[PDB]
């Protein structure tokens, strides 16, 4: 089921959202992350999102709720995946390179060794060309 390495990855991803590290993700923090990813949600849109994952309805997202949400890997939109792919593939060539992934990690404020970026690319790469194309990007989250 949910591996322990996934719980490790999701706990790290959670720290990327929870800027102050107070253990909760707020609309403000969700707003800065989304804007760092080239998005631009409104206060209400941001609040709507927290709601779609705020199990106890307290307004903020805790790791349990975030882990729960991630658990919903059972999902799989070709325009929702498409926008995600686009934030990574900055030069728009159809391939996410290690350098592009690094750039998004940077905007997200995550420090990773080149080896670590190669590894992430590695686990998503299927054909072995050392890059991630749309087809491999999709499978990476469905």
């Amino acid at each position: 089921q949910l591996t322990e390495e996934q719980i490790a990855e999701f706990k790290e991803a959670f720290s990327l959202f929870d800027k102050d590290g107070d253990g909760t993700i707020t609309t403000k923090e969700l707003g800065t992350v989304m804007r760092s990813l080239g998005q631009n949600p409104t206060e209400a849109e941001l609040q709507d999102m927290i709601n779609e994952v705020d199990a106890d309805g307290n307004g903020t997202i805790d790791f349990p709720e975030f882990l729960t949400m991630m658990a919903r890997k059972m999902k799989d939109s070709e325009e929702e995946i498409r926008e995600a792919f686009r934030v990574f593939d900055k030069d728009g060539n159809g391939y996410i390179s290690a350098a592009e992934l690094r750039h998004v990690m940077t905007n997200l404020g995550e420090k990773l060794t080149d080896e670590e970026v190669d590894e992430m690319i590695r686990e998503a790469d299927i054909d072995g060309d050392g890059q991630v194309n749309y087809e491999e990007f999709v499978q990476m989250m469905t």
């Binding site: 996934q6 990855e9 590894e119 992430m120 686990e123 989250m141």
Partner: peptide, 6 residues
């Protein structure tokens, strides 16, 4: 870090 879903 290491992986994601299947």
């Amino acid at each position: 870090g290491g992986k994601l879903s299947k």
